[PDB]
Amino acid sequence: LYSLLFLLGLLGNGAVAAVLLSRRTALSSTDTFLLHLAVADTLLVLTLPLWAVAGALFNINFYAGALLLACISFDRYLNIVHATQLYRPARVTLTCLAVWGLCLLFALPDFIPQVGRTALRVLQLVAGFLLPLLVMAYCYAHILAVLLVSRGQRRLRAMRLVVVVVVAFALCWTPYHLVVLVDILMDLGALARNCGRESRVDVAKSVTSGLGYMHCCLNPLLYAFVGVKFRERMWML
Amino acid sequence: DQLRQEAEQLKNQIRDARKACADATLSQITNNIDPVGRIQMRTRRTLRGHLAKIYAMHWGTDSRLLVSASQDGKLIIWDSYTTNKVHAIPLRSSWVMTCAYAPSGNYVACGGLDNICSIYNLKTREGNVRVSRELAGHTGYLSCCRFLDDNQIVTSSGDTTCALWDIETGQQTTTFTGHTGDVMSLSLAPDTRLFVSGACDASAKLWDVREGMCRQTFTGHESDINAICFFPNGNAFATGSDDATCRLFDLRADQELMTYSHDNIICGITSVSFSKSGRLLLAGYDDFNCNVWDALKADRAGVLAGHDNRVSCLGVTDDGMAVATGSWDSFLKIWN
Amino acid sequence: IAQARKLVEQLKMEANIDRIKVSKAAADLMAYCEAHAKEDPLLTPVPASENPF
Amino acid sequence: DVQLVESGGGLVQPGGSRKLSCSASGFAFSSFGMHWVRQAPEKGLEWVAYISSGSGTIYYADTVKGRFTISRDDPKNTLFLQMTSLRSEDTAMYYCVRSIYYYGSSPFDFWGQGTTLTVSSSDIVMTQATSSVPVTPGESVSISCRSSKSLLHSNGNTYLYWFLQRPGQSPQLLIYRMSNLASGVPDRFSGSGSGTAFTLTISRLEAEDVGVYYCMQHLEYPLTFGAGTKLEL
Amino acid sequence: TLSAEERAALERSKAIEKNLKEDGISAAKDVKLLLLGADNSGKSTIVKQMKIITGIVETHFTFKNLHFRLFDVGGQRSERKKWIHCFEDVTAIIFCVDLSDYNRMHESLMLFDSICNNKFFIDTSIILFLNKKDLFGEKIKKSPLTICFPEYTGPNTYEDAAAYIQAQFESKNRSPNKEIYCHMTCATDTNNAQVIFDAVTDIIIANNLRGCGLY
């Protein structure tokens, strides 16, 4: 089962990367972020055989997933909520470097300590899975509210897709970070250690890592293959 | 009443006389000429700086300077070799559908939905481009402009009429009529003594610039003609239409020699031009491509795959070293 | 009644034109495009030393 | 009509400071690069400073770097040269010259009328061998000037300029690169050369052509003029 | 760009680009709307804040932090098929209809079918304006709404008549993704711009939904 996902990870991501990279003109702000995510998950899927330096790039990619997905959400909020005030392509490569940059700052210890790993875990939970989720929730909630006051036939499908994306992110990421929180509390002295529970916890790490891989493989489907604009480029190329 | 019968029989005489001359097709005389092979041409420059779509383009006589007109109300003069912007002229009206570069390089002309053919002077003592004259008199939009000298310009309008102006005085020296539809383009003969114009009524006619008379009329297209250009030797011209075909007409023979239709092509032609030798016939379609046709055998010799939108103009340098194409994606690409 | 008066007049001018066989007319288009063939950069790619682009 | 007028010269004590003003009227001043060119009493032209369009670029000749500073005031259509410490070597007539740079432009076409300044008491070198050349009307004449490097460039453009200074007037441009006739001059003038040797030839000499001819190079700064050749009638 | 002059030429090029870019920014907050309709149909006095500026006539009124440009193509007297592609990028098509001109009604219907079904405008929303309610209300009493529409079957009351006329215009949609924001206006109606402003907001939101991939 793991082997099948690996090609699915490469196959799906490559096409998304290929189609956008084949564009002969500028790429909208959303399009650029999608391109970054495509490569980000592309690197992670390449690690599948090894886990089934390697660790270091893993941490860089995982946060790339969350932060970029957060980055896409904010852009959609600006375009749709305050649409009157942002009528106009705008280059956004500045922010992407930061999100990749924020990965590098946390990734340095991977190449390179109890307290050190503790700070790593604390930062990981604080600004890797919580803040991105809160940002996505707020932005997409406002988009939903505005669409309910909108008019047309596209509003309902947009609401359905938004709910689907947020639910998918939550259900595919929460199991890993919940367990990371549990282990954090354990190491901080809030719980008791035993061999069987430790083994179950490591198995939980394994299963949740597989689930995160599944979300990475699904990223192309939910952010690219559903859009109308993307499909016409695929049909053209 | 009777004149209608006289009109009908006259057409029959022309058709009969036209048919008698036809002995063998062009493809039948040139069947043993070796092909031209696969023409591979790769983009050399990418002139960007336009915001809106680009609707017209013309090459300077010296094969180095360019002029392009866009919908954003800017008229830019490019340096082809270095991709520098020599000039950028603001336009009174943002709706432009043509632009011409004078042979001498001193003037440049523009026009569009405003029904006015403006002429700008580039070699001014004050160092900035100024509007020397505004030519008015057409009652519809303006389709194409072409310079004969520094004091004479021939224009084509949607009024179903072309004209020959006198830039100095500003009046309309000679007016040409006979069309029954919008005139969509024209091209000047190399010796600047005749010119042809293709209209929306699916017919092109040859006109005597000095005399103000229609010397010939050519038919065969099923729809409107969008572009036209003379063969380099001045004895034939090719036309592009919405019928998704190009045709080659011969003035001396007064007929149609060959057709450049393909089963895979569905959309209409927007521009047409010949190469210096006259062996390649380049046309830009609405499928975001320009196809190179072997003018002597009706064989696609290649494709200039570029641009993300419709191709709206074509151009071949007088020395024949390059080809430029403009498209609605707001980019000009020079192909060598 | 008067609009078509000139339409017939024009056709008479166009109908009296001394034409030539297409066989000859097509041949010239073959002769010319062959003579001025060595001076066409697009048709025969030029050496990279002589290309301004 | 195009017009450049300068003012602010006079007599100043050594070490004093003055401000020269060149006020333009009759063209798009914002789009022209303006030069300062000085001519010591019967010595010959010498470049001083240059400020581009939008003040993006500035240069100076080594003789005055630091002491002179050049500034431009676009909204007011004015050019300023601020001189801090004046030696006795700076006494000269200063000219305000315009220049517009683009493909096929004429970058020295107009010169100001000039102002007089009095003070109380590596580089391409261009030489004009002959100092005087007597001649009578209707006789063909030739003027030549050499150079250190080959002005011919990769582009194929030979950067050399020919100026004519009539008695009591400011110079006037004749040939701007090697053979292009400046607008407004009679066609009788012609120019030719190759690499490092150039010549200006006149046919059907007229009575208004008596004066001094300077050959200038614009390949790379600092600009340098020739000593000058005088035509005597 | 090694040469001295060729360096100065490059500056001029960069300074030109700066002005081209900046003029784009100053001309980014303008919404382009195309005006269409039959003659004497109120297409000249939709909004009393005209500030106009043969050929093409433009009106550039501004309102609520947004610049509106209306392009009137009346008077061309040509075949639309050849200059219509010029306005392919307009935000919305403002259509005018006079409910008091029965004879011209069919001409208006014909125009709507072509404009709505043109391949270029397959995605541009239409802001339908129905003008002169009071004249319509007064004229219906003297002449029943049957002569122009023999197929009409409902009552001869104002509300039903106005409702039916709207349906005929909407019945020419024959396509999805394109929505029509119908409105009724009188001669003494100051709040016409407000209707354009809000409807433009919904059209823009529809586009961004396409660009952002949510649809």
Numbering used by the authors:
A (entry chain R): 59 to 110, 126 to 161, 165 to 188, 208 to 332
B (entry chain B): 5 to 340
C (entry chain G): 9 to 61
D (entry chain S): 1 to 121, 124 to 235
E (entry chain A): 4 to 56, 183 to 231, 242 to 354
Sentences from the paper on this structure:
Chemokine receptors belong to the superfamily of G-protein-coupled receptors (GPCRs) with primary coupling to the Gαi subtype of heterotrimeric G-proteins and β-arrestins (βarrs). In this context, CXCR3 and CXCR7 constitute an interesting receptor pair, wherein CXCR3 couples to both G-proteins and βarrs while CXCR7 lacks any measurable G-protein activation but robustly recruits βarrs upon agonist-stimulation. For example, VUF11418 and VUF10661 have been developed as G-protein-biased and βarr-biased agonists of CXCR349, respectively, while VUF11207 is characterized as a CXCR7 selective agonist in terms of eliciting βarr recruitment and activation. Here, we determine cryo-EM structures of CXCR3 in an Apo-state and in complex with small molecule agonists biased toward G-proteins or βarrs.
In addition, we also purified CXCR3 in the presence of CXCL10 and reconstituted its complex with G-protein followed by cryo-EM structure determination at 3.3 Å. However, the density for CXCL10 was not observed and therefore, this structure is referred to as the Apo-state. However, some of the regions of the receptor such as the ECL1, ECL2, and extracellular portions of TM1-3 in the Apo-state, and the extracellular region of TM1 in the VUF11418-bound structure were not resolved well. Interestingly superimposition of the Apo-CXCR3 structure with the VUF10661/11418-bound CXCR3 structures reveals an RMSD of <1 Å across the main-chain Cα atoms. The overall similarity in the arrangement and conformation of the cytoplasmic side of the transmembrane helices (e.g., outward movement of TM5 and 6) in the two structures suggest that the Apo-CXCR3 structure reported here represents an active state of the receptor. However, we cannot conclude whether the active-like structure results from priming by CXCL10 used during purification and reconstitution of the complex, the allosteric stabilization of the active state by the bound G-protein, or a combination of both. The interaction interface of CXCR3 with G-protein harbors an approximate buried surface area of 3900 Å2, and as anticipated, the distal end of the α5 helix inserts into the cytoplasmic side of the receptor transmembrane core. The carboxyl-terminus of α5 helix in miniGαo makes extensive contacts with the hydrophobic surface formed by the cytoplasmic ends of TM3, TM5, and TM6 of CXCR3 including hydrogen bonding between Ala345, Asn347, and Cys351 of α5 with Arg2496.29, Asn1523.53, and Arg1493.50 of CXCR3, respectively. The terminal hook residue Tyr354 of α5 helix engages in hydrogen bonding with Val323 of helix8 in CXCR3. While ICL1 does not directly interact with G-proteins, ICL2 interacts with α5 helix, β2–β3 loop, and αN of miniGαo including a hydrogen bond formation between Ala31 of αN helix in miniGαo with Arg162 of ICL2 in CXCR3.
